[PDB]
Write a protein that binds this ligand. Structure first.
Ligand code: BT5
Ligand code: BT5
Lengths: 322, 322
């Protein structure tokens, strides 16, 4: 219905209290039976709504679906984001964000339940199943030189890792520059992009894909031995709204640090959060492949690497395989 | 008409020969009187078309209007550009290009007769009068690191300056990093932007605005003492199609050099093409202003400056006033 999101937003706003169907009807200026039909439909999609005679309706639990009405409350109370766009299915939130940022200076995020053309680094396929992960692009407006893109990427990683760690009983680690792991399984990839010129960044677009509720059978093919979801490491049901709220909080925290601190302030905590040390790594550089060991992360965020031939490299980015 | 661009493209294709109305009618599968009406309308907009009984029509001259039908011939025979978009009026070709490049790897350009929201560096107003200049954005796909943006900007300047110089009896000079001058008048501003991440450039967007046919009375306000058009320096009528063709050629030439040569190969020719030397310059850095002298352009394209206090600076970009 036209009014399903409005009814949902009133339910959400009123937690922990019940609201009457009559009160929702007066807010939206619709009949009481139209309100009943909307609530019957929301319950059908998987909202747990407790309805008690003479008292009204309490939203108790939301399904694994993004609702614009609820996300609207997340943005209303945000000091970072002006708005959000929520979709059931789209080609890519990253493409959507790149189009939406043009001609304005808004900060915003895009969420979609599904992507049909999700891409990672190097334009690799990113699997984005309906109702099973968080597929998001975040647009921000830092007043910084374009070379700061690498620094951003280091701060945001810790914010993502912290959010995931809150829901996982297992050790969550960063794999520089762009992956989050739990044990031997990738739970998240994120991709930082920019629109920039010589005078500065016009926008940062951070694409973030986090596996939330896949069982291993849901991972399909042979990323399976290499992939994991938060639910596989959580004894409790993972609630996507609880998670999103925690994630938005850590992103804002880490984004304020990016704006105000040198990377050297964060560098030790980043080292201790990393799973790249004391192991042989496979680097790919265009058509070249070589093995090496990561020996340090310098004060400017460059990986210091000693290859199998004994030669040192100082790398702003790489693609690393375990 | 639906067919005006098609008729125009056939006329253009057939130069220097006349084509009959009957032959245009058979190509487009329309009546002979529909062809006559299209030609009558094109003549009304300012096309000079010579019509002779029994023989047909020759396009002799186009007006100061961009026609998609003609621009289509420029792209068909291009080794650089896959397509173009031509508009009579748009907010900005730069905004249009930023939207159009998303989700593809095409190389292309956008032209508009007018812009209602033309912007330069720092989001300054760029005046874009209907029928008086070339207002263009070019999208290219160099396979390079994001830090190469500054180098691109140095090569393209010489290509623009060369094209303008061909139509001007006066000395055309580059004002680093982003302006082209004839004497004391700015004839052109260009703006290089990119979409990039740590793995490379996804697109370069070069916004190029060249004043073609303004009289001084057309410049309005008090940019007048500081602004000029190519026509004010040309004894001949300036033909925008001739100019565009020359400009596209020099851009491709200079873009191939960017891909294959170090800036040190071009550096002396850039110095000799510049009007910034042996004069006091005003620099603006955020809220700071200072005077200085440009003393050299280094091998990486950095301006070397000695300020009024005697201190040296090495600058990748600046905003300079005379
Ligand atoms: N759902 C998944 N979970 C764990 N691994 C996956 C996966 N789908 C694909 N993979 C594997 O991990 C690699 C991903 O490549 P990279 O390391 O280049 O690239 C990345 O790690 C980052 C992906 C960013 C995805 C988000 S989803 C929201 C936004 N919209 C987009 O379209 N993109 C962003 C693949 O080559 C696969 O082996
Ligand atoms: N038509 C004009 N001719 C000469 N000067 C002008 C002018 N309009 C404005 N100006 C002056 O020059 C300055 C322009 O600022 P900058 O130096 O920051 O910035 C530039 O020099 C570059 C402009 C790029 C314009 C093109 S037109 C096609 C494409 N689409 C766009 O929207 N933009 C690009 C202004 O502050 C004015 O003083």
């Amino acid at each position: 219905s036209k009014y399903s999101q409005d009814v949902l937003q009133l339910l959400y706003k009123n937690k922990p209290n019940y609201i009457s169907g009559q009160s929702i009807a007066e807010s939206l200026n619709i009949s009481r039976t139209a309100v009943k039909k909307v609530i019957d439909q929301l319950k059908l999609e998987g909202c747990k709504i407790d309805s008690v005679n003479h008292k009204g309706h309490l939203l108790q639990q939301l399904p694994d679906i993004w609702y614009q009405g609820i996300i609207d409350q997340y943005t209303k109370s945000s000091a970072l984001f002006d708005f959000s766009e929520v979709y059931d299915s789209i080609d890519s939130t990253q493409l959507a964000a790149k189009k939406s940022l043009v001609g304005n200076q808004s900060s915003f995020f895009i969420l979609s339940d599904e992507q049909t053309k999700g891409r990672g680094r190097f334009n690799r396929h990113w699997s984005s199943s309906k109702g099973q992960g968080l597929w998001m692009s975040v647009v921000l407006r830092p007043n910084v030189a374009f070379s700061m893109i690498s620094k951003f990427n280091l701060f945001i990683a810790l914010g993502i890792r912290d959010a995931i760690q809150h829901f996982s009983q297992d050790e969550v680690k960063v794999k520089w520059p762009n992956d989050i792991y739990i044990d031997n399984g990738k739970v998240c990839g994120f991709l930082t992009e920019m629109v920039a010129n010589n005078d500065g960044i016009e926008a940062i677009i951070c694409g973030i894909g986090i596996n939330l509720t896949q069982q291993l059978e849901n991972f399909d093919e042979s990323i399976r031995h290499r992939a994991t979801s938060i639910q596989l490491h959580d004894k409790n049901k993972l609630d996507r709204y609880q998670f999103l709220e925690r994630l938005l909080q850590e992103i804002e925290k880490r984004y304020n640090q990016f704006l105000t601190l040198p990377f050297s302030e964060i560098r030790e905590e980043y080292i201790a959060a990393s799973n790249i040390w004391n192991r042989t790594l496979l680097f790919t550089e265009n058509d070249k492949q070589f093995k090496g060991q990561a020996i340090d992360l310098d004060y400017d965020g460059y990986l210091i690497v000693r290859d199998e031939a004994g030669e040192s490299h100082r790398l702003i980015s790489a693609d690393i395989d375990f």
